[PDB]
Structure 1
């Protein structure tokens, strides 16, 4: 029998209203583990490149990680996968909370949606009971608001609900899916969900979930908890607060945001304010945050409590975590009070807290320059704050100028013209990046910006420190108990690495060292997004409780399959290449893999070419970014190599 996984999925046709439970192939588990990996397998051989994002044949997959529903601490992530309406590439999005584990308790590993529903509806799951309900009375309702009404309707107080806001219903290219204190935020997956007339997905589960090696599996679980205690008694020395400990960026706990407000760019990723964090500002923001934060809450089976309930006066309560705390504030040149109030509106609407702020600031720059006229913004209010609330409503409704801005900075500038493309200066593969315009070229981050399939920098980094220690004693101390490294050489790299001089960036670490680092950091994220493990306890923070050495044990004891360190490394490489192959088939080439032209002020073309060339070699790809026939056959992806040749993507010989 199957373990960790349930071995079953739901196939839903929203056009015919048909529902079907189908057993999964156990071979898929051995090759692609689960979550993102198996999502990639499904999308590959069911979604050909001729399928458009808002086409009925486009798929919307809700996947619970392999180890979700087990006692594994923090393992609770949902992986939503589809074809992005913004980037035209694959879009996988992660969501925390309690939804994924509930699905497992219901008896399912995934839910795959195809076609479209003519009427607004939501899916109701209660163990073996599955049905489609009408949701017309929920039209326009906010994401969180929607969940509460449903749980009253069905009389299921303990059901978990993933819903879309008005933004998703109106197919905003950066619309999200909201569930309590969790969000599948990026990729426009909310736009696809709305396009299919799917207002929400409600699931309740009370079945058992089994593991293969009970005693052994709980042993590793306790080993993690013990490490979390010890780790939280020994934060990383001389790092900032929101990087010393475990979990997601603890921005709800720490009031200090000097690193953020003085190193990140305000507005349309435009302005840098070196001396913003004054005493008056630090006190005003701490007061606002103490009054707004009700409680620090956690995800399922996790003690880190990264999120927080936010209560602004005269506004409904919503939940928040990580960097969305500042994006609306910094993009509007305002304060933390404004940011918390508009984030409430945006979370209910279901918008990406990264792109949305940059799109609105992008619009005001165009209005400032004169590329957009005041006639495009009728009835526009006077205040800077009021203008953001104004433009926010225009976007979610796709009203007038809001209809164009609802497509993202790339497509909006494309349609606007008149030099609007010049102000879309912060995109990679048509996707907005973090507002960061640093001075000196970073050889490690350059690679992560160019090749990251998520196209987000915060979701590929983690395991290697972002900066070197000034003193050698500090490095020797760090590498002392750095048991998470796959190889001793990662310790030796950090020892030699210095902030200034003959061993500083961009010329050090070397090109070969940078490639190895990027490959390790990326590998841990892909393992996380297949197992369902929150990165906060794994691939994100320094020296995590989960790593390349005990992960194989969790899989073996949990799922009952043969798994070791090397076999796991190869697995992660397998469906990370498959994801790559999916984007190749959709027209992605080396040309698309370049950072923004103004991302760094000091550029080194010859070093950057050597970096991307060497990294491709390590991955086993072409000098155009395409996985060769040799590496594909070696990975067990022969069917990919055949289709590449047949499609002319790869040449025979």
Structure 2
């Protein structure tokens, strides 16, 4: 009997209309844990590179993490996977809320969608009962709106709904999937859902979900809760107030946005406004937020309550968390009020709030220089704010220039020509990065930008501090109880690291120290994304309650399989290396692993080469970025190497 995982998946062919429950291999759980890890294994040996994103054979996968549905705090994440229409690489994407737990109580670990439905439909799951319902009456309805109509329809007030808005239905390349206060936002999974004619997935679950060693397990949970209490009485000293505590970035609670508005670039990641955070602005924005924030609310089984319901006058309520609070405001050079308003529309439409704002700022910079004319904007309103509303609607319906813009800055530029390419200056692998254009090369972040498979700086960082402390005393205070470090050497690094001088960036930490740090930071995300654990209590914040030393205990008591610290490291390596193999098979090479040319004012060609050289070797990869035969072998990935040799990816 299986524990923690349900041990079954639902296989659905949207072309035939077929639905089937399948027992999973208990070995794939020992090897790859679950979530992202198992998602990747399925992609690897069911989606060869010949497959397009909007090919019927593309797979759209919904997965509950291995420990979702157990009592573990914050363990509630859904991992959605597919081939991205925008990057043409794997897109995995995470959604919090309450959906993944509900799927586990319904009895399933995943839903694998294949094919295309000729008519718009949605999937309905109530424990053992699974059917495909017609969805044509929901056409073009907002993602949250759709969820409420469906729940009335079926009389399932406690069902959880994941849906696409019109954005997805039109295959916008950065279309999201929305569920209450949660979103699978990036990489266009929303578009693949829409391409398949799938409007929503409704799940209701009332089955039990067991753990292997009950007393041992609830013990660890209580230990985690005790740590959450401690950690909130003790914020990281002298650190930006949003990044001093647990949770996703606490931007719904904290009104201090000095850090963001003064160091991140406005417009099309174009403008620094170093003195933006005045007392006047601070009060205006606080007034706006105080009035807008209805309640701070949590995902399933979590006390951190990072998100908030938002009510603007004359607009339906919606939910928000993290940086989307500022992206529309900063892209449009506007105020907090405007951001909250347009974010409501863009959430209902279902759009990636990181990519959308830059796509629109992108477009207007083109109108500015003349690369686009006024004629390409028929009926372009006069005011700045009206113009973002105007363009948002065109994009979401793919109307005229919107059809182009809806493909993202990379594809839009190469379609427009005339020099638009110069203005798509903030992509890595065809995916928009955060609007950051800093001064001095950061060797740690350099490696994360280049190599992260999520292609998003905010989902690979976290465990190691972003800046050093000026005083030795402060550093010694910090390493003192830093139990999370995989190894004592990370304390020593942070002790030596200084803001200025011999031991300052970009030459210190050393190349090898940077490789160790980035490896650790990324490993914890990959573990989170397999277990279903929210990064807010794990990989994202400093000194989390979940870490490399108690995670193996959680997996052993939870799922009933042997697990220790070293085996967990090797597991996370195994499917992080598998995700790598996938993107390699789809053509990714070292040449693609480069940050935007203007991402730092001060660059060091030779230092950068040594960094990436060294990181690959640590990964056990090529100098081309390909995992090697010997590495694939040690990891239990023999079939990867043999396939790589037959494709000529690796010489024999």
TM-score, with normalisation over the residues of structure 2?
1.00
1:610-652 deviation digits (Å, cap 9, x = unpaired): 0000000000000000000000000000000000000000001
Matches within 5 A, 1:474-623: 474-623=474-623
Q: Helix, strand or coil: the match of 2:439?
A: strand
Give the distance between the partners of 1:274 and 1:550, measured in 2 at CA.
42
Q: Helix, strand or coil: the match of 1:555?
A: helix
Which residue does 1:441 correspond to in 2? 441
1:503-546 deviation digits (Å, cap 9, x = unpaired): 00000000000000000000000000000000000000000000
Give 5+ residue unaligned stretches, structure 2.
Answer: none
Which residue does 1:419 correspond to in 2? 419
The Cα shift of 1:425 comes to: 0.1
1:216-243 deviation digits (Å, cap 9, x = unpaired): 0000000000000000000000001101
Q: Helix, strand or coil: the match of 1:31?
A: helix
The Cα shift of 1:182 comes to: 0.1
1:454-473 deviation digits (Å, cap 9, x = unpaired): 00000000000000000000
Give the distance between the partners of 1:445 and 1:459, measured in 2 at CA.
12
Which residue does 1:472 correspond to in 2? 472
Matches within 5 A, 1:66-215: 66-215=66-215
The Cα shift of 1:306 comes to: 0.1
Give the distance between the partners of 2:351 and 2:157, measured in 1 at CA.
26
Which residue does 2:350 correspond to in 1? 350
Give the distance between the partners of 1:389 and 1:243, measured in 2 at CA.
32
Structure 1 vs Structure 2 CA RMSD: 0.2
Q: Helix, strand or coil: the match of 1:161?
A: strand
1:324-377 deviation digits (Å, cap 9, x = unpaired): 000000000000000000000000000000000000000000000000000000
Give the distance between the partners of 2:428 and 2:2, measured in 1 at CA.
41
1:46-69 deviation digits (Å, cap 9, x = unpaired): 000000000000000000000000
Give the distance between the partners of 1:88 and 1:411, measured in 2 at CA.
11
Q: Helix, strand or coil: the match of 2:243?
A: helix
Q: Helix, strand or coil: the match of 1:266?
A: coil
Give the distance between the partners of 1:454 and 1:505, measured in 2 at CA.
25
Give the distance between the partners of 2:323 and 2:377, measured in 1 at CA.
29
The Cα shift of 1:14 comes to: 0.2
Q: Helix, strand or coil: the match of 2:280?
A: helix
The Cα shift of 1:442 comes to: 0.2
Give the distance between the partners of 2:29 and 2:53, measured in 1 at CA.
27
Give the distance between the partners of 2:397 and 2:607, measured in 1 at CA.
46
1:245-303 deviation digits (Å, cap 9, x = unpaired): 00100000000100000000000000000100111100000000000000000000000
Give the distance between the partners of 1:345 and 1:289, measured in 2 at CA.
18
The Cα shift of 1:405 comes to: 0.1
1:38-85 deviation digits (Å, cap 9, x = unpaired): 000000000000000000000000000000000000000000000000
1:567-592 deviation digits (Å, cap 9, x = unpaired): 00000000000000000000000000
Give the distance between the partners of 2:239 and 2:392, measured in 1 at CA.
36
Q: Helix, strand or coil: the match of 2:326?
A: helix
Give the distance between the partners of 1:539 and 1:278, measured in 2 at CA.
33
Runs of 4+ in 1 over 3 A off after TM superposition: none
1:129-164 deviation digits (Å, cap 9, x = unpaired): 000000000000000000000000000000000000
1:433-465 deviation digits (Å, cap 9, x = unpaired): 000000000000000000000000000000000
Which residue does 2:28 correspond to in 1? 28
TM-score, with normalisation over the residues of structure 1?
1.00
1:188-245 deviation digits (Å, cap 9, x = unpaired): 0000000000000000000000000000000000000000000000000000110110
Give the distance between the partners of 2:567 and 2:518, measured in 1 at CA.
19
Give the distance between the partners of 1:293 and 1:512, measured in 2 at CA.
45
The Cα shift of 1:19 comes to: 0.2
Give the distance between the partners of 2:498 and 2:370, measured in 1 at CA.
46
Give the distance between the partners of 1:442 and 1:636, measured in 2 at CA.
34
The Cα shift of 1:183 comes to: 0.1
1:474-526 deviation digits (Å, cap 9, x = unpaired): 00000000000000000000000000000000000000000000000000000
Alignment pair present for 1:2 and 2:8: no
1:545-578 deviation digits (Å, cap 9, x = unpaired): 0000000000000000000000000000000000
The Cα shift of 1:605 comes to: 0.4
Q: Helix, strand or coil: the match of 2:226?
A: helix
Q: Helix, strand or coil: the match of 1:366?
A: helix
Give the distance between the partners of 1:407 and 1:535, measured in 2 at CA.
29
Q: Helix, strand or coil: the match of 1:62?
A: strand
Which residue does 2:381 correspond to in 1? 381
Give the distance between the partners of 1:4 and 1:187, measured in 2 at CA.
29
Q: Helix, strand or coil: the match of 1:202?
A: strand
1:400-432 deviation digits (Å, cap 9, x = unpaired): 000000000000000000000000000000000
Q: Helix, strand or coil: the match of 1:241?
A: coil
The Cα shift of 1:21 comes to: 0.1
